[PDB]
Design a protein around this ligand. Structure first.
Ligand SMILES: [O-][O-]
Ligand SMILES: [Cu+2]
Ligand SMILES: [Cu+2]
Ligand SMILES: [Cu+2]
Ligand SMILES: [Cu+2]
Lengths: 72, 273
């Protein structure tokens, strides 16, 4: 069972998530994310810090980016 | 052929190491190491094929990866070897490792930009090319995302584990490998990446020279574990889907198996084990 989709503006950036297994986007640019065996998630810009959900991972990326555009 | 504790390096060894690293960067050879690691960090999954991370091959893989980098460094200056960072001993932002004559310190608050050392962006000698976060300067936030680095006591508890790895051979696994990697337990290796922050916390972590010293120590811990448990060895040892078995060849090389990298003395030794 894949997680639900989401769409919101977090810290001035538009973040979206949707089942594909799951894709995330920050201002339209796709962010690589991954699901762990225990159900937690991690993204390419926070790959050693598991968070509970895809949205938590997207918010973590926006946090890390500090306003910077994401690169494909 | 002797990997030394970064804390024990002479001003000369430090100078030569930095110069060799900067030359690999200038010649364009360095960036390709960063690309390779990210590619594997993005494709290694708990559900499918995993070679470089969250699997038993996490150790022999990074062992060979570091061997490649060290060999590249030696092609520039044959006297240089990869030093290691014992983060359980040298645990403060004031460790000699973070001085301007070696790796430089932490980033400034505003954007986490490292402002000193040979790898600061302002030197024009360390451009961040292979990246996801569009910014092109080295960034760090020592102890910003996590309060403390692992302690000796904690490392000791992980080294005590007799089982190399345990099914399902992934991030949910119990056993030495997964505890050293950090997905389960007190968390060793993963927590360190988080402590440094900046690019070190991402898939393109090799962008930070400290990546090599960090993994050189993780590599040593595997050596120390084998000493503690001589009766214990690499697993799985036969036909396990999506996981690299002992005598199975490893990507991206394909000409090497975990079995060929178990004994490190065939390539180097440590100042002390
Ligand atoms: O593991 O980087
Ligand atoms: Cu890695
Ligand atoms: Cu992917
Ligand atoms: Cu445990
Ligand atoms: Cu690592």
């Amino acid at each position: 069972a894949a997680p639900e989709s989401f769409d919101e503006v977090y810290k001035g950036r538009r973040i979206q998530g949707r089942p594909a297994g799951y894709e995330v986007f920050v201002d339209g640019v796709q962010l690589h994310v991954m699901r762990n065996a225990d159900g937690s998630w991690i993204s390419v810009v926070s790959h050693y810090d598991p968070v509970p959900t895809p949205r938590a991972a997207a918010r973590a990326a926006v946090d890390e980016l500090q306003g910077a555009p994401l690169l494909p | 052929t002797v990997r030394k504790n970064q804390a024990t390096l002479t001003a000369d060894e430090k100078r030569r190491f930095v110069a060799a690293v900067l030359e690999l960067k200038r010649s364009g050879r360095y960036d390709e190491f960063v690309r390779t690691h990210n590619e594997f960090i993005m494709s290694d999954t708990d559900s499918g094929e995993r070679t470089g991370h969250r699997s038993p091959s996490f150790l022999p893989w990074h062992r060979r990866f570091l061997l490649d980098f060290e060999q590249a460094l030696q092609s520039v200056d044959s006297s240089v070897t990869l030093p290691y960072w014992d983060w359980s001993a040298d645990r403060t932002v004031r460790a000699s490792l973070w001085a301007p004559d070696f790796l430089g310190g932490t980033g400034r608050s505003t954007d986490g930009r490292v402002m000193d050392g040979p790898f600061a962006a302002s030197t024009g000698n360390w451009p961040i090319n292979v990246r996801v976060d569009s910014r092109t300067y080295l960034r760090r936030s020592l102890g910003g995302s996590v309060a403390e680095l692992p302690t000796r006591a904690e490392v000791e508890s992980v080294l005590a584990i007799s089982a190399y790895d345990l099914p399902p051979y992934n991030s949910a696994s119990e056993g030495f490998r997964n505890h050293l990697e950090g997905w389960r337990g007190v968390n060793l290796h993963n927590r360190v990446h988080v402590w440094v922050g900046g690019q070190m916390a991402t898939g393109v972590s090799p962008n930070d020279p400290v990546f090599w010293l960090h993994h050189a120590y993780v590599d040593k811990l595997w050596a120390e574990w084998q000493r503690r448990h001589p009766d214990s060895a690499y697993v799985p040892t036969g036909g396990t889907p999506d996981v690299v078995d002992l005598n199975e060849t490893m990507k991206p090389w394909n000409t090497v198996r975990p079995a060929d990298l178990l004994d490190h003395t065939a390539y180097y030794t440590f100042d002390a084990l």
